[PDB]
Amino acid sequence: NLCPFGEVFNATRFASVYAWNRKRISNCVADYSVLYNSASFSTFKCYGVSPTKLNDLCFTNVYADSFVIRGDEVRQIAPGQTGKIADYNYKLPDDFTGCVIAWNSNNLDSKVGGNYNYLYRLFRKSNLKPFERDISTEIYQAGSTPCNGVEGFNCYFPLQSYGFQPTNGVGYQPYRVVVLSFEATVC
């Protein structure tokens, strides 16, 4: 049985980083060399294994996490990194074994007035643990007085929205990301 990668990569809607998506991959066979040759995949870098030897291996269980960041934040989706995305949205462990894949999606995910559907968490009192998903919408208490569900002075919405216009630089453009985590399910 061939593996449902088309369901992941070619999906119609993509999640925002703070609420990233996570699909299981099990009991399947997959050809990774076809993927590795895609012109779309600006980033296709593995940790532990090498993309070349992916077809000759197999893994106990595989996860495909997927989300949308902006081009110059793709470098945070890697072990040992820091930044808003790596700290507060999606965190890889230092011992990560898997692959990070990213392609530019300027035509699907940008919009001339701005595409405000994609969000990321700006504020959090402490960093995310590896593979943690925080989806809290609670007003962020930046001062000693509580916020009582109303944003204001020292009381911020924890989620900000990307602008995503197609005319900005490549670092500002939306990139779709898929993270394959490898632990016999998928060979």
């Epitope: 995949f41 980033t43 296709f44 870098k45 110059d72």
Partner: nanobody, 121 residues
Framework: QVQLVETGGGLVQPGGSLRLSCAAS????????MGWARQVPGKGLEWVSY???????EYQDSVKGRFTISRDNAKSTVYLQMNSLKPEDTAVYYC???????????????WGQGTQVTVSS
Amino acid sequence: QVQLVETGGGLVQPGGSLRLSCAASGFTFSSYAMGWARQVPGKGLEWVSYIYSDGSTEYQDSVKGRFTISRDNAKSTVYLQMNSLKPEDTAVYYCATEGSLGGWGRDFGSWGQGTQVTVSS
């Protein structure tokens, strides 16, 4: 911090060649890999060539044989020799570097401003 400047773009008539160069700055260029990509207006950004610190290269199949990626560590520079150009190849070409050092495979971590190449008639 990291700064990558592309030049060399311009007008070519079909069949002609073009040498693109990208000057690096803000990091030990000796240790990082380098890449060249291109965006067609309205189409997704696509990678064309990659070069590792070991000199190992990758060429994407749509530019196979015709392009040649190379590097001079002495001058922190990467080059892209475009022979046998077609109107399919007109785009804004970008130069790029790894984001971080670990790992195996292509990594377009930091981007240049880009230079336009246009195949004429």
